[PDB]
Amino acid sequence: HARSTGSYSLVTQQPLGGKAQFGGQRFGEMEVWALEAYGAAYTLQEMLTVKSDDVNGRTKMYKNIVDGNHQMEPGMPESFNVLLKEIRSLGINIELEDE
């Protein structure tokens, strides 16, 4: 099985799972620890922001690849803003501070 780009889920902006659903590989927790074990800071940054979740990042990246410019414009993951709204939907005021 292989996936470059196709459909994703509803709640989250990450790719679907499986083969019958044309989906990508779950880059799990211990693989993130293995990339932290190297100096792979940029590989991990595209591994969890551009390739997976951030919608503006992935559309800009697809257009940047097909122009011939391997460069990522990262932004913030969508599932973290989903986390902010689920935590904030309690009586909890979680924010994002100064520039």
Binding site: A2, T5, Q14, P15, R26, F27, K51
Partner: peptide, 9 residues
């Protein structure tokens, strides 16, 4: 841990 495009198995 996230699911990831441009990936295969």
């Amino acid at each position: 841990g996230k699911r990831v495009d441009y990936s295969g198995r």
